Amino acid sequence: TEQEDVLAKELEDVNKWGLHVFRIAELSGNRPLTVIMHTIFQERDLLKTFKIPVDTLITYLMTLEDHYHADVAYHNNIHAADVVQSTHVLLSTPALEAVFTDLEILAAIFASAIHDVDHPGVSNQFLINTNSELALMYNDSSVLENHHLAVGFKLLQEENCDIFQNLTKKQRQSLRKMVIDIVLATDMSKHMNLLADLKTMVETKKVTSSGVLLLDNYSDRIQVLQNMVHCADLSNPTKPLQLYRQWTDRIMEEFFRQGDRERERGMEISPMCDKHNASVEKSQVGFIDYIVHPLWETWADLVHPDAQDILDTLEDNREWYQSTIP
Numbered sequence: 001t002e003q004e005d006v007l008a009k010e011l012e013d014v015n016k017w018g019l020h021v022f023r024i025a026e027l028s029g030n031r032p033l034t035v036i037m038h039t040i041f042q043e044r045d046l047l048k049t050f051k052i053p054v055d056t057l058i059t060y061l062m063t064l065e066d067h068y069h070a071d072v073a074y075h076n077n078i079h080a081a082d083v084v085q086s087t088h089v090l091l092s093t094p095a096l097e098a099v100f101t102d103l104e105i106l107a108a109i110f111a112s113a114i115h116d117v118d119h120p121g122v123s124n125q126f127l128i129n130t131n132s133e134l135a136l137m138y139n140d141s142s143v144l145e146n147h148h149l150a151v152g153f154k155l156l157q158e159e160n161c162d163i164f165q166n167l168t169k170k171q172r173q174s175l176r177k178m179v180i181d182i183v184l185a186t187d188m189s190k191h192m193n194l195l196a197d198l199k200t201m202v203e204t205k206k207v208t209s210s211g212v213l214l215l216d217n218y219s220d221r222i223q224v225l226q227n228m229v230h231c232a233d234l235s236n237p238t239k240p241l242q243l244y245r246q247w248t249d250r251i252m253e254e255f256f257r258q259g260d261r262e263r264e265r266g267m268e269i270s271p272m273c274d275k276h277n278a279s280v281e282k283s284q285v286g287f288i289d290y291i292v293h294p295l296w297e298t299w300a301d302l303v304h305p306d307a308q309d310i311l312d313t314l315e316d317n318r319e320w321y322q323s324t325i326p
C-alpha cells in the first residue's frame with residue numbers, strides 16, 4: 001500500500017538526526033518503537049550477530065510497545081522510539097568508531113527502548129509525595145527507573161519474547177548489568193553528578209591520532225554509555241524546531257495533567273505544572289541554559305568536533321524560543 005511505501009522512505013533516514021518520528025508513528029499504526037527498533041537491528045546486523053529469530057524480536061517489541069501508555073502525552077512509545085533512534089545515531093559518532101562491542105551496542109539500544117516503559121505520566125517526587133505503591137516498593141530512590149527496568153526485563157519471559165535466548169550466560173549477565181547501569185542513570189536526580197564525572201573524563205581523555213576515544217575499563221565505558229543515553233533522553237531541544245516544539249507541547253500537557261492531579265488532592269503544585277500560571281517559553285530557555293546546553297557542550301567536547309551540528313541546532317532553537325518572549 002502507499003502508506004507502507006511512505007513509511008519505508010521515512011525509515012531511510014534512521015541514521016540521521018531529525019528523523020520524522022511523529023510521521024513514522026502515524027504511518028506505522030502507532031508502532032514507532034517496533035518499526036524503528038526492527039530497522040536499527042537490521043542496519044546493525046544484530047539479528048545475525050546474536051542469532052535473534054525475527055519473529056521473537058517482533059513479538060517482544062510489540063509487547064514492550066504495548067506497555068507504554070497511549071494516554072500519556074510525552075512518556076510514551078514515540079519518546080521511547082525517539083531515544084532509541086537518537087542513541088543509534090550517537091553510537092555512530094566518528095569519535096566512537098569501533099569503541100564499543102556489539103554486546104555494548106545491543107545493551108545501549110535495548111536500554112533506550114525500555115527506559116521509560118509503563119511510565120504513568122507523573123514524576124518520582126509525585127509518587128513519593130502521594131505515598132504510592134511504587135515509592136513504597138522502591139524506597140523512594142529511582143522509583144520509576146527501577147520500575148522501567150523491572151518491566152522491560154520481565155517481558156522477555158513472555159511467550160516467544162526472549163530475544164537474548166542465544167546469548168551465552170556470560171553475555172546475558174553482562175548485558176543485564178549494563179542495561180541496569182544505563183537506565184538507572186536516566187534518573188534526573190543523578191544528572192549533576194553524572195555531568196561532573198563526564199567533565200572530569202573530558203579533562204584527561206585519551207584519543208588516537210584520528211580523535212577516536214580510548215576507553216579500557218568498565219567504569220569509563222559504562223560512563224560514556226550512561227551519558228550517551230542520558231543525552232538522547234535530553235535531545236529534544238537539539239532537534240529541528242518543528243520536532244522540538246511538538247515535544248514541548250507534549251511535556252507541558254503531561255506536566256499540566258500532573259498539576260491537575262495535585263490540585264485535586266490539595267497538594268502544592270509542582271514547578272511548571274500549573275496550567276493557570278505557566279511560562280512555557282521561559283521554561284524551555286531555562287531548561288536549555290541550566291540542563292541541556294551544559295550537558296551537550298560537555299558531550300561535544302568529548303567527541304569534538306562531531307557534535308557541532310547538534311550544538312548549532314540547540315543554540316538556534318534557544319535563540320528562537322527566547323525571541324518569543326516579549
Ligand SMILES: COc1ccc([C@]2(C#N)CC[C@@H](C(=O)O)CC2)cc1OC1CCCC1
Nearest residue numbers: 188236237247248251252255272283284287
Ligand atoms: C521538551 O521539554 C522537556 C523534555 C523533557 C524534560 C524532562 C527533563 N528534565 C522532564 C523530567 C523527566 C524526568 O525527570 O524523568 C526527564 C525529561 C523536560 C522538558 O522541559 C522542561 C519541563 C517543563 C518545561 C521545561
Ligand SMILES: [Mg+2]
Nearest residue numbers: 115116144186
Ligand atoms: Mg525516565
Ligand SMILES: [Zn+2]
Nearest residue numbers: 079115116233
Ligand atoms: Zn525518557
